[PDB]
Design a protein around this motif. Structure first.
Motif, PDB file in Angstrom:
ATOM      1  N   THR B  95     -35.147  84.576  16.432  1.00  0.00           N
ATOM      2  CA  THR B  95     -35.424  83.178  16.119  1.00  0.00           C
ATOM      3  C   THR B  95     -35.286  82.323  17.375  1.00  0.00           C
ATOM      4  O   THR B  95     -34.498  81.379  17.411  1.00  0.00           O
ATOM      5  CB  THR B  95     -34.450  82.640  15.048  1.00  0.00           C
ATOM      6  OG1 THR B  95     -33.102  82.791  15.507  1.00  0.00           O
ATOM      7  CG2 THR B  95     -34.625  83.391  13.737  1.00  0.00           C
TER       8      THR B  95
ATOM      9  N   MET D   1     -47.123  94.475   8.022  1.00  0.00           N
ATOM     10  CA  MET D   1     -45.753  93.890   8.073  1.00  0.00           C
ATOM     11  C   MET D   1     -45.776  92.420   7.671  1.00  0.00           C
ATOM     12  O   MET D   1     -45.529  92.081   6.514  1.00  0.00           O
ATOM     13  CB  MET D   1     -45.175  94.031   9.483  1.00  0.00           C
ATOM     14  CG  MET D   1     -43.774  93.470   9.646  1.00  0.00           C
ATOM     15  SD  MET D   1     -42.545  94.349   8.666  1.00  0.00           S
ATOM     16  CE  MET D   1     -41.910  95.506   9.876  1.00  0.00           C
ATOM     17  N   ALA D   2     -46.076  91.551   8.632  1.00  0.00           N
ATOM     18  CA  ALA D   2     -46.129  90.118   8.373  1.00  0.00           C
ATOM     19  C   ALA D   2     -47.380  89.757   7.581  1.00  0.00           C
ATOM     20  O   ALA D   2     -48.105  90.636   7.116  1.00  0.00           O
ATOM     21  CB  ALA D   2     -46.103  89.350   9.687  1.00  0.00           C
ATOM     22  N   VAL D   3     -47.629  88.460   7.434  1.00  0.00           N
ATOM     23  CA  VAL D   3     -48.789  87.984   6.692  1.00  0.00           C
ATOM     24  C   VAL D   3     -49.534  86.892   7.457  1.00  0.00           C
ATOM     25  O   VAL D   3     -48.925  85.947   7.960  1.00  0.00           O
ATOM     26  CB  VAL D   3     -48.375  87.426   5.314  1.00  0.00           C
ATOM     27  CG1 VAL D   3     -49.593  86.915   4.569  1.00  0.00           C
ATOM     28  CG2 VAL D   3     -47.676  88.508   4.507  1.00  0.00           C
ATOM     29  N   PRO D   4     -50.868  87.011   7.551  1.00  0.00           N
ATOM     30  CA  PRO D   4     -51.701  86.031   8.255  1.00  0.00           C
ATOM     31  C   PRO D   4     -51.759  84.692   7.525  1.00  0.00           C
ATOM     32  O   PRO D   4     -51.844  84.646   6.298  1.00  0.00           O
ATOM     33  CB  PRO D   4     -53.059  86.721   8.313  1.00  0.00           C
ATOM     34  CG  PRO D   4     -53.083  87.493   7.036  1.00  0.00           C
ATOM     35  CD  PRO D   4     -51.698  88.098   7.003  1.00  0.00           C
ATOM     36  N   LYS D   5     -51.714  83.604   8.289  1.00  0.00           N
ATOM     37  CA  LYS D   5     -51.757  82.265   7.716  1.00  0.00           C
ATOM     38  C   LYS D   5     -53.174  81.859   7.328  1.00  0.00           C
ATOM     39  O   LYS D   5     -53.637  82.161   6.228  1.00  0.00           O
ATOM     40  CB  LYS D   5     -51.183  81.250   8.708  1.00  0.00           C
ATOM     41  CG  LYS D   5     -49.720  81.478   9.061  1.00  0.00           C
ATOM     42  CD  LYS D   5     -48.823  81.362   7.836  1.00  0.00           C
ATOM     43  CE  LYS D   5     -48.881  79.970   7.227  1.00  0.00           C
ATOM     44  NZ  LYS D   5     -48.010  79.851   6.026  1.00  0.00           N
TER      45      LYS D   5
END
Lengths: 121, 154, 113, 57, 116
Positions: B95, D1-5
């Motif tokens: 972060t 993993m993450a997610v596209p905006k």
RNA sequence: GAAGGUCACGGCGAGACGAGCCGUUUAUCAUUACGAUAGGUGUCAAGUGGAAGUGCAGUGAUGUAUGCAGCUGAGGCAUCCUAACAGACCCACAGACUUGAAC
RNA sequence: CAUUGAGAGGACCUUUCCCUAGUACGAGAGGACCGGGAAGGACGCACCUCUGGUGUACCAGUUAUCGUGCCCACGGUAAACGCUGGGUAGCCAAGUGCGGAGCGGAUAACUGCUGAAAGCAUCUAAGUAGUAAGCCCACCCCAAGAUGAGUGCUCUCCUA
RNA sequence: UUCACAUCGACGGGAAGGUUUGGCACCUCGAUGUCGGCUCUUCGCCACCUGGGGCUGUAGUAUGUUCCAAGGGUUGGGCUG
RNA sequence: UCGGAGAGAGGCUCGGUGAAAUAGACAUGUCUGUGAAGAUGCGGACUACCUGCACCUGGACAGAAAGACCCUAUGAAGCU
RNA sequence: GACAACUCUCUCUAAGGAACUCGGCAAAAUAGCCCCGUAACUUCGGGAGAAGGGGUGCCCCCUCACAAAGGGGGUCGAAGU
RNA sequence: AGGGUGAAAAGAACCCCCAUCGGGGAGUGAAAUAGAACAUGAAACCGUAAGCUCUCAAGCAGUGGGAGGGGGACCAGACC
């Protein structure tokens, strides 16, 4: 390769029998300790009637190593079980005689130790 | 000087002979030029013997070499550890703004690249037949080019 | 450097001009050889007994893991072509077993075996 | 993993469709091998005694 | 690439290589032409020619070890008295490869192996 | 529609895929232009190891002589007998204006 | 194809011993500054021909069991080569070898000379000379995709 | 000892910086996972060591304080989360 | 403690079949400062050819979850 | 097919050895039968399969087999549950 | 969940390509640019062709000024 806390069967009559490494003296940080380097270790098992009782912080020199030591003469030297000899702050061993032969790599540092020694390799 | 090459040969007829693999240039040091014979030997007749000579070979290649190999200093278990050891050790923050701190140790790739060893004395030297003996080292595996420059100790 | 792909093997071909006594002497043979002992040097040479575990290489051939019985457990091999070396003499007739590996005669250290 | 905006969809996606250019007969020339009248594009059996043929003359 | 690599290990364990190879081998000296991938062709290539040179020397020394590869007692005698004797004048080049049209529904490779 | 590039083929102590390096059966033209990159083969070295068969000793096991024989992966030399096919395509045709120094 | 080259990054840490003077210095004890040499630790990279490790695709010993008709001789399988041992090439390491520099331009703190205003004096206000591992440069890698798209050599095309 | 400031320094004062203890609780309870260790670092400074200097109740060898400077480097374990 | 090598199942390439969390819109660089005050889209300035693959994975107070923490609403559900 | 980073399931690993870590977690190792032998304590039923050791392979002979086992002799490999 | 081709289906013989799936023609009908997914059949989304802009240029990027270019003008008159 005499790293911290290691068993080194003494090669004299200082009283000890087998001490355990504690710290390798040399520079800022010593990783390994080859033959010909002083090492501060403590004895675990020693003979009763002796000038050196069990559990003591005394310096010593490595006379034998289980690792393959090499020299400029392209010659390699090694032994079965690594050993060491108690040494006084002055530079001379507290003991009188020496056992387990001796390493020539010590004649460059301690001549007396190699002199008294029975056989040199 | 026939197979493969073609244009480099015809573009060498300019007072000279026998073309190598790759023509390399040098700097100033007071030497002969194309007006007497145009042909340099391997004696140097000036660099003096006994002195040390540098060797610039071509490094090998370990493919997409990781980070634990370009530094070799990352602890990690495998029989129970979740890092599997081989892992780069998980670098980075969680972060923090910054900018991923570019240039930091990472896997990347590996391949042919200049090396140069410098120094290194000599044991034997021979001319004509061409042959030199370097004190070990010798960057790259036998099959490169090397510059075997004199010595830029200065 | 004469053009004949023999140079890389010339330094070895010119050094191998020192014929080896024992064709293989794969046994107990306790030869002393010679050991470069400088420091106050008196131009004298010393030697140590040897054993099995004979090794070698296509290049700088190696003698064998001494594993001598003198003192504790003297070992470490050496080279013959070395600048300092003396002729080798046989000891006891060759036996039968294996020339390359032998962990025995070490943990079974005794008068027999 | 993450997610596209935000999914641009248009444009971006289209550009990433050039690397899949029409790979016209991925192979060398291997043109007419003489007395073939046509023959497949890529290299094929040469001309000589009946070879590779299941039956002979 | 492995510095000095030779003989592909395929996508199966070692013991799985010295098993499948035993097939394309006998089937080659029993029929003539065998279809297979380009990789297998290059692999079986040596495993076949190295088995032919053994028959050229004859004797039993090149028969006991040979049997360790192929099990068919029918194709074994062949080499010891059939085609190898035909190459008694030719040093090598016992096998021959050649690429062809891609697979059916599958990409590649594809090639036919046959004795010269 | 050249130099050249690219593709493919045979490979690489270079690569995830591309790139990059060497070569493509006259091992591209003259003058020897030094042009087997791989697999196989032959020899050698190295690593195991002194096996199969046979003869002999012993009831047998086992051992001995031939045997320091044979086998043998990427190492080295040598050998191109197999595959590297004759060819194509792509890329073009001395190629802008003004000014200065030359002609 | 070969280079120059605008820039950027990396390297840039350090100890002991000896010579020098164990003088100078000090009642002793104890023990330099300047300069030079040798030998290490930590770390980075490469090489790995030597010392060693991996090698279930080399070979050998061998247990249980099946099969090759059988003896013999072999092959397959056995938690994750069945177990176990050695080993060539390559790849790495406790392996091997080398660079961490010196020498310059320009400075910080400070030490300076001569000489002002404050006819003494004072580093300047005007003129100059020294000055650390910082800065620039020197060594190394990339580098005109720095489109202010450079430089040098050579090759091919002048059918309507 | 003497002597105020080599060092330190009572009664009090003026600031910088800002990581401590708090207030505020301004933006987030249709949520931004707490500490520590490990892996891998970046920057600044009033940097402890190496280097260059002034003073020293600093002889030397070693220290105390202060100024410039961080280029670099800056530990292994017993016990406890 | 410095780990390295090798054998497999994925990862990478090609051929066939063929998903998702999520999403206002995109031609969604860094940094300082500023800003209901730790934004790439403000201001200044620096830097920067267009467009993929593989991998490492800090930012977009990323995604899933109108949070189980606190409080508020003379709410509710059990218990003593 | 390729076969690098990395992830998952494993082999083999010089010296030393848990010095890692919250915790020797995870691994490694021990782990066959017979025989010998076996501490504190005990409501003395136990711990005692403590711990710590030796041999057991194969063939021959004693019976040119009394299904085994045991006792001698000889012999192979580094290792004989 | 899922509505209706046409008035009557004459809801497509035969011919050509393919594995005697599928399509295109030949015909029928005022229509099949209505035929069994079928009426009128927009939008979101997914493409081809044509003109212009588009690699040294960056920030919800439109707007105001505004050159050039591909076409359309008027028997200049400077515009779409």
């Amino acid at each position: 390769m005499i790293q911290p806390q290691t068993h080194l069967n003494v090669a004299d009559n200082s009283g000890a029998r087998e001490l355990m490494c504690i710290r390798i003296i040399g520079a800022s940080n010593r990783r390994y300790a080859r033959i010909g380097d002083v090492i501060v270790a403590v004895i675990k098992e020693a003979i009763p009637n002796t000038p050196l009782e069990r559990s003591e912080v005394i310096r010593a020199v490595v006379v034998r190593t289980c690792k393959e030591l090499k020299r400029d003469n392209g010659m390699i030297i090694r032994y079965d079980d690594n050993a060491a000899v108690i040494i006084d702050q002055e530079g001379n061993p507290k003991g009188t005689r020496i056992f387990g032969a001796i390493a020539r790599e010590l004649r460059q540092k301690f001549a007396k130790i190699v002199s008294l020694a029975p056989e040199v390799l | 000087r026939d197979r493969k090459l073609t244009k480099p040969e015809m573009g060498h007829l300019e007072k000279s002979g026998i073309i190598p693999l790759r023509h390399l240039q040098e700097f100033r040091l007071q030497s002969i030029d194309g007006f007497e014979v145009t042909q340099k030997l391997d004696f140097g007749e000036l660099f003096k013997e006994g002195d040390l000579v540098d060797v610039s070979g071509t490094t090998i290649g370990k493919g997409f070499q990781g980070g634990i190999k370009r530094h070799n200093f990352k602890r990690g278990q495998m029989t129970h550890g979740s890092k599997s050891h081989r892992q780069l050790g998980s670098i980075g923050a969680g972060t923090t703004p910054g900018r991923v701190y570019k240039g930091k140790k990472m896997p990347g790739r590996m391949g042919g690249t200049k090396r140069k060893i410098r120094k290194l004395k000599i044991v034997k030297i021979d001319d004509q037949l061409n042959i030199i003996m370097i004190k070990g080292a010798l960057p790259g595996k036998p099959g490169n080019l090397l510059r075997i420059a004199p010595a830029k100790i200065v | 450097d004469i053009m004949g792909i023999l140079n890389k093997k010339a330094v070895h071909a010119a050094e191998e001009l020192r014929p080896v006594p024992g064709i293989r002497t794969g046994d107990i043979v306790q030869i002393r050889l010679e050991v470069p002992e400088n420091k106050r040097r008196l131009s004298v040479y010393k030697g140590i007994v040897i054993s099995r575990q004979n090794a070698g290489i296509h290049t700088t051939i190696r003698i064998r893991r001494i594993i001598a019985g003198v003192g504790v457990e003297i070992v470490f091999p050496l080279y013959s072509p070395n600048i300092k070396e003396i002729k080798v003499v046989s000891h006891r007739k060759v036996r039968k077993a294996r020339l390359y590996y032998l962990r025995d005669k070490l943990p079974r250290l005794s008068t027999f075996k | 993993m993450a997610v596209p905006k935000k999914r641009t969809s248009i444009y971006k996606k289209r550009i990433r469709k050039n690397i899949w250019k029409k790979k016209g007969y991925w192979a060398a020339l291997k043109a007419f091998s003489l007395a073939k009248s046509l023959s497949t594009g890529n290299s094929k059996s040469f001309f000589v005694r009946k070879i590779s043929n299941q039956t002979l003359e | 690439m492995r510095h000095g690599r030779k003989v592909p290990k395929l996508n199966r364990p070692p013991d799985q290589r010295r098993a499948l190879l035993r097939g394309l081998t006998t089937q080659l000296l029993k029929h003539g032409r065998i279809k297979t991938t380009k990789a297998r062709a290059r692999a079986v290539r040596k495993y076949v020619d190295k088995m032919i040179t053994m028959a050229k020397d004859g004797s039993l020394h090149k028969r006991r070890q040979a049997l360790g590869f192929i099990y068919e007692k029918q194709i074994v005698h062949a080499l010891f008295a059939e085609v190898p004797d035909r190459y008694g004048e030719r040093n090598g080049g016992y096998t021959r490869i050649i690429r062809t049209l891609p697979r059916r529904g599958d990409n590649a490779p594809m090639a036919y192996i046959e004795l010269v």
